[PDB]
Amino acid sequence: DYTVHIVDDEEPVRKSLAFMLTMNGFAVKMHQSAEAFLAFAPDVRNGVLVTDLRMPDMSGVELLRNLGDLKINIPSIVITGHGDVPMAVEAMKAGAVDFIEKPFEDTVIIEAIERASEHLV
Asked: Do the annotations mark residue 115 as ligand-binding?
């Protein structure tokens, strides 16, 4: 019993990330944007964080940077872009438990979340 908190700058859409995770029995809680999650983060208990924000303006590396400046224990999975190396390297340098180069299928994302749900209890 743990929650997967997603954070994407993209419109809902019946078929993308959250709805997949929930079709697979996962407790999912979506968030409109980084600042929105940043402003709720203090109130999270037993959850895993899965970022994924494309635009370099507000990257997932900075969202991890800010969570570190509050001393929050949220095991994260920073989804990156196809062939984006420095970012995926920067994320592991920001406390990230893993990364996932896009595209990706259910399997890998589900697996990785479970390996993150270890760093909890």
From this structure: no
Neighbours of 106 (CB within 10 A): 12
Give the range of the structural domain holding residue 87, as residue numbers without chain letter. 1-121
Q: What is the CATH number of the domain that holds 103?
A: 3.40.50.2300
Q: Is 8 one of the annotated binding-site residues?
A: yes
Dist. CA 118–CA 120, nearest whole Å: 5
The answer, yes or no, to whether the previous bond of 103 is cis (omega within 30 of 0) is yes
Do the annotations mark residue 54 as ligand-binding? yes
Tell me how far apart the alpha carbons of residues 32 and 12 are, in angstroms, rounded to a whole number: 9
State yes or no: 69 annotated in a binding site. Answer: no
CA angle 52-91-119, nearest 5°? 90
User: Into how many domains does the chain fold?
Assistant: 1
What backbone phi and psi angles, to 5 degrees, belong to 22? Answer: -80, -30
Tell me which amino acid residue 21 is: L
Here the contacts of 8-16 (C-beta below 8 Å, separation 24 or greater) are 8/51, 8/52, 8/53, 9/33, 9/34, 9/53, 9/54, 9/55, 9/58
